[PDB]
Amino acid sequence: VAHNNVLPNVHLHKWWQRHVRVNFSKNIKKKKRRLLREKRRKANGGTPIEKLH
Amino acid sequence: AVKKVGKIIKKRTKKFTRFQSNRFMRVKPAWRKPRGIDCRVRRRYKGTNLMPSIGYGSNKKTKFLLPNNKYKYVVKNVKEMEPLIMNHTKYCVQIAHNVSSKKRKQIIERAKQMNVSVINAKARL
């Protein structure tokens, strides 16, 4: 190390490439989830799908 | 060698060839600046290739004029050469390489009506 910086700290010393995960489908998944919980309502035929807490 | 015709003065006419381009045929003649210790062209030894410099620059008043003593504008179709009707004594036209013969005939006969000169009005004839 040579300047006025903060002392380095990074935790990259194992085989870190094998487990990296880029999220490409976070909106596709919410569309899918919305359609499933909407399909449930049409099968309950008037009764709600929530419960009292 | 200075060349001068009217008011136009050229400060040199020969090209600046690349060092060693006459001896090795993998070296092309386009100029590249010599870098690297022990060159004899970078160190300005007498008797070898000269280097270009800003001192050979041309007069601002005559920097882009042709021997015609006019500036050159290149046109591709009829509608592009209409801005020349206001400045016809300072510009001359040249037709682009990839236009067809039929288009060329019309461009030429309009340039004739506008009283502007055509540099290459002999091609494809």
Added chain:
Amino acid sequence: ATRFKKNRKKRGHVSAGHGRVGKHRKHPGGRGKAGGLHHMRINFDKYHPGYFGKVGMRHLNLLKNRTYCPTINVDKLWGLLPEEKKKEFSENKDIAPVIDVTRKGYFKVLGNGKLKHNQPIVVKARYFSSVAEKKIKAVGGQCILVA
């Protein structure tokens, strides 16, 4: 963007900016924080003085929710009111506001600043400092402790 990178300027030069005699070799002084205390000592000493050694007592299982405590000075105490509501308390002298800072996320009232002279105010909180409590008593107010 690769368009504006410094390396494109040195594309015709031999050494790419790293020098003829001292090349760009790989790890010529160690890896990471390697040489400190031996041959990186000066950098450590003049940029990070107190780095080596340990001091103090251990706390084995902290649980930070036990000592969470945001604060507010008496400077910012009349500013929590809207300006129109701040206005009428000036004219009328018979009524004072009662302020509950724990409804706003503050826990301890702290005592920097100046309160308006002869303008009483009543404050609720979990903790007070001595100076703050005195300054509230001086302009004719009262402090109330809650939980």
Added chain:
Amino acid sequence: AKSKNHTNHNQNRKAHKNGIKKPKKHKFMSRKGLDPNFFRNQKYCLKGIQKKKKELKLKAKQEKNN
């Protein structure tokens, strides 16, 4: 194996590159560790002077508004 071990060739050429700099010549310095029992008294003197000056200023602010 053997090499040079000392010279100061070129050193004052580099020294005179950016001139020989002088101290900045300030007006006041800090009397932190200097003669005690003389500057504590000076603090008392200046407190008295300030009390007189501010009393006069307050007085004038009191008459001028009538």
Added chain:
Amino acid sequence: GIALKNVGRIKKHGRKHLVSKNPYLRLLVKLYNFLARRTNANFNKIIAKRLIMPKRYRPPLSLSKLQYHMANHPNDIAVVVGSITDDKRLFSLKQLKVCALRFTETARKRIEDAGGECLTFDQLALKYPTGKKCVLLRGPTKARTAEKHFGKAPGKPKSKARPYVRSKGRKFEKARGRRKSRAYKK
């Protein structure tokens, strides 16, 4: 040859143009350059220079400090080449006339509620061409946190600079070099 320094050529040491591309700021620069040239007033020169500086040299000014600076200058105009911001620590505000490059919403509301007004620089060019009864003001230019790390290195005797650290606590750079009990203090 000839023995000159920086041979025959004069050095200048600052910013020369705008870097920003806001068209309205470019119009302002043109206007005050013209005013500076054609009436060398020393009032329009300074303004023409200040609205060229980078962001760090145009700090904000608070309402309370602005009112404090104008206490002995009733019915005058304060000129700031920055933003002015609100201050909750004030209880009341007087009537003020202020020209500034930007106002925040709360500060603008408070100023107009007391009977004051807010001005842009193109109106000040139209009403006070040479700055009669106008007071130039600046905010605190060395109050930024980044300036707390500059100066002498932290470690030189009796310095005041902050260090660059991951976090703060008894375990983060407090042992050797900051107390006498571990071998020396600073």
Added chain:
RNA sequence: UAAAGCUAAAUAUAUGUAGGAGACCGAUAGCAAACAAGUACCGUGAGGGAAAGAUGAAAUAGUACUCAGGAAUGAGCAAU
């Protein structure tokens, strides 16, 4: 409220099979392999492992006839 047991959903998917797409590569590039490619070939064996795309719109137009020559092949007053 230990020293016995069962149990959906919200999570993962460098494999197999099908479908859709890209500011990606363009035959020394892209998978090793755009072609009878894990093929031809090398090693006792465990294993190693390539090169090689394009006539023309149409051959349902791929060169008929004559002369010289043993033949290949060449030439034409002859031919798509």
Added chain:
RNA sequence: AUUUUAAAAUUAUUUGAAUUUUUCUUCUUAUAAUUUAAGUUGUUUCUAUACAGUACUUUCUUAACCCACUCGUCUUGAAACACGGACCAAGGAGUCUAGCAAAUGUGCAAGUGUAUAUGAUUCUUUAAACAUUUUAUACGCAUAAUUAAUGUAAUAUGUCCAUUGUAGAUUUGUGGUGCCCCACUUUGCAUACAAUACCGGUAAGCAA
């Protein structure tokens, strides 16, 4: 398109005085012109009464006169009896991600950033774009420091006032020389140098 003016010089008529006594004697004490002022102007001939010729412009080739060791690299020092290079074509080397800082541009500002989700008369594109739960406590960084620590926590209620001094940008009123600079007068940003008060820790003194 209004400093190729003004002035100066010259020449020919003048209005007056000198002295050196004169066909270049002085002093713009009145009008006209001229240049020696206020960076080249004129007359003849040729090209030529041409349309590309053997002439003019231009590009190659080959002589002469003077000069010219093999590039790249390490090195105090390379033409070196230091190393790599038989020739040609294609390929071929400071990039990506995390985390921090400085600089600069942009938005808002004592706050700022709509996380994961959910909503919608979003649904080739759209894996984009749009929205935020019908005196309003998700979380990060900032708004307060200091101490191993129990912890404690920033002038102080006489006045919503905003600690003190020296130099200093801008403003106010008179005078000097040319809106500028000076001599007083008024106000006193940023910042530099110091002083003082207060908060956390430690000594000292006293201590229920």
Added chain:
RNA sequence: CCUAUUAGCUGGUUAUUUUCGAAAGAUCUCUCAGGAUCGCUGGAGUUGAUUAAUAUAAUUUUACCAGGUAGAGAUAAUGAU
């Protein structure tokens, strides 16, 4: 196969013009073919001067201060003769 293991050491590192321009000293180092740190360089930005002034200076002048080298001495001290 782990694996494109590591190398303070050899070799290489791709367009133009224009502007500024070095070090081969010094401190610490299982340090002596390396490194950190100061010095020398470039870029960015404020504050100033643009008033033939003041700040300033590898230079003189005037006033004053400190020195034991060239020379000299041996009959003044020491040591030689």
Added chain:
RNA sequence: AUUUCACUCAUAUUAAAUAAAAUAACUCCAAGUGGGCCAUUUUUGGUAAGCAGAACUGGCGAUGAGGGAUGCUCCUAACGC
């Protein structure tokens, strides 16, 4: 010691001379370098050396042009067309 108030000390030639003296002062972020050698003069070891080790300046390195027949360091003199 400090705080006030009154009076008064050359300046247009500037409290001695000279000055392409503000091409100044300061802060930030970074590169390369940390094997050197040579000449006149002073100087240590060595019989000496194109040997080894120091001092003050100027150079070569990083630099070409005219001269010394020739030559990294000598003399003149440093570089747009």
Added chain:
RNA sequence: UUACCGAUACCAAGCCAUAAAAAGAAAGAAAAAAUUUUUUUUUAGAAUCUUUUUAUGAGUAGAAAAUCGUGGGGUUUGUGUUGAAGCGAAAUACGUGAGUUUUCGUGGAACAUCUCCCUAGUGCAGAUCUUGGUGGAAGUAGCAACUAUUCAAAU
């Protein structure tokens, strides 16, 4: 004692660039050729812009600005069977330079954008560099163990 010859240094003048400076954001007719009628040329105002003045110019390691070119994307507006890209030879051509532009020939199907932006696997003389093709040496070295061949006929 005189004359002379001799630098990229010194002096005078032109031009390029760098640095600094003096100024500009309230626009009106000048010649020439033709016998007071027509004809030519110009009649400017972009702010990192336009006029004008002075001084200056060496450079390895290194740093910065402006500029030239390549594959692909958005916007704008273009070329092509009356011949695109590419390739060979060139030019009274432009630029200090990297380059840009054009003619002829070949070719047979696509190619740009400089109006302003986005983007990257983006620029080769070398690495005993990788893969492929090709030279001088050169009609040269050489075609040598194993005793040995001859006459006539057929094809």
